[PDB]
Amino acid sequence: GTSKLKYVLQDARFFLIKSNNHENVSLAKAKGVWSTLPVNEKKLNLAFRSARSVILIFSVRESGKFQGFARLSSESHHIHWVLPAGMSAKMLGGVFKIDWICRRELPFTKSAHLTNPWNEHKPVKIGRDGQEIELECGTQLCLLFPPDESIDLYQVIHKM
Ligand SMILES: CNc1nc(Cl)nc2c1ncn2Cc1ccncc1
């Protein structure tokens, strides 16, 4: 069902995460962790204190898809990431704990009807790493993903 999912997304904040490679998203799915650039790290730490749920929606660049979404369970704290060209390791030192809500893919073709008011009403697939997605758009985007029946949202609801 979708009732527990809708409960978790209630009054949530949503952020687009753009990863340069699949390996880091796979590692995030395996380890329950994410790290971002300092500008976005600051934004996510503010958001974590501000909302009942902060949802990260992941997309690997050039994949044409989202790879899933997860809820922050912590602020950043100080993994074996693969870093972009010129991207170093100290720029990714803050580590957030995350609980996955959906590890399934969604192709961009399926979200073409969703625009993001916080990015000039461009299609929600468009945006830089860290772009906030307005509540209604983000909720509908997360509801488009195939259900992930390997995940039990009961423990996620208890974190809240
Ligand atoms: C583990 N965290 C990450 N891993 C990877 Cl491969 N890309 C990321 C990550 N966070 C943000 N981006 C995108 C980016 C945009 C501009 N300059 C450097 C990176």
From Swiss-Prot:
Task: State what protein this is by name.
Answer: YTH domain-containing protein 1
The reported effect of residue 44 to E is: Does not affect ability to influence alternative splice site selection
* SUBUNIT field: Interacts with SRSF1. Interacts with SRSF2. Interacts with SRSF3. Interacts with SRSF7. Interacts with SRSF10. Interacts with CPSF6. Interacts with KHDRBS1/SAM68. Interacts with TRA2B. Interacts with KHDRBS3. Interacts with EMD. Interacts with RBMX. Interacts with ZCCHC8.
Where does this polypeptide localize?
Answer: Nucleus; Nucleus speckle
Q: What result is annotated for mutating residue 34 to D? A: Abolishes RNA-binding and ability to influence alternative splice site selection
Q: Which gene encodes it?
A: YTHDC1
Impact reported for residue 37 to T: Reduced binding to N6-methyladenosine (m6A)-containing RNAs
Query: Which positions in this protein are listed as binding RNA?
Result: 18-20, 34-35, 81, 129
Instruction: PTM Phosphoserine: list the residues.
Output: 88
Span within the full-length protein is: 345 to 507 of 727
**In UniProt terms, what function does this protein have?**
Regulator of alternative splicing that specifically recognizes and binds N6-methyladenosine (m6A)-containing RNAs. M6A is a modification present at internal sites of mRNAs and some non-coding RNAs and plays a role in the efficiency of mRNA splicing, processing and stability. Acts as a key regulator of exon-inclusion or exon-skipping during alternative splicing via interaction with mRNA splicing factors SRSF3 and SRSF10.
> What does the annotation give as the result of altering residue 34 to A?
Abolishes binding to N6-methyladenosine (m6A)-containing RNAs. Abolishes binding to m6A-containing mRNAs
